[PDB]
Swiss-Prot record:
Residues of the Thioredoxin domain: 1-104
Catalytic residues (UniProt): 29, 32
Lineage: Eukaryota, Viridiplantae, Streptophyta, Embryophyta, Tracheophyta
Disulfide pairings: 29-32
Protein name: Thioredoxin M-type Md
Known outcome of mutating residue 32 to S: Prevents scission of the intermolecular disulfide bond by the second Cys of the active site
Site note Deprotonates C-terminal active site Cys, residues: 23
Amino acid sequence: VQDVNDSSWKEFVLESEVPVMVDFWAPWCGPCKLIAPVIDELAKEYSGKIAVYKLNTDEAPGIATQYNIRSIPTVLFFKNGERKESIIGAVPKSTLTDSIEKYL
């Protein structure tokens, strides 16, 4: 994705055919979109395995709501448009890695 919002959520996130992961970033966090720390690493770690996305929280006041994302960052782990695991904080690298391999 370029930037995930409510429209692109169904299209990119729920329609990749492949295990999906979404970094929730916030403008008040700074330029957190191009940071996506552990998520950026899970990209090269699971090259092909996963579809790596970054949600513009301010742009999606429905997604952030629905998924109960209280922390920036937060990451959710989907398979093929189906949600498996939610790592609030999205910071302990090992847990995030653990989270794909769980279902993938």
